[PDB]
Design a protein around this ligand. Sequence first.
Ligand code: VCA
Length: 97
Amino acid sequence: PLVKRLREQPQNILTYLSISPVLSGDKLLGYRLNPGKDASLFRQSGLQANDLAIALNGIDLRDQEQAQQALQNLADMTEITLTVEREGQRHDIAFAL
Ligand SMILES: CCCCCC/C=C\CCCCCCCCCC(=O)O
């Protein structure tokens, strides 16, 4: 699963984020995000509680093979962008790694 795979990164991503896939029927809607033990990324121009992650570096997280590709690619990246849906609207947030 994607969460179990994010745990391999030297950045302690799961210290900053609590993540659950969101299912509807046979569809994955995205990944629901909330603060980890360190809530630093949650701020006005950053993430919000209950944001829905739908893309990583422009790759659709809802599509299983694409998401796999996006995750293998995060390994040697220096800055990554997350697209979230928040009360109907998309927002892009970048993170320095
Ligand atoms: C659903 C897929 C979610 C993947 C999201 C990854 C998002 C953010 C990574 C945040 C890393 C934050 C700390 C990076 C290491 C150094 C930064 C610091 O000084 O804390």
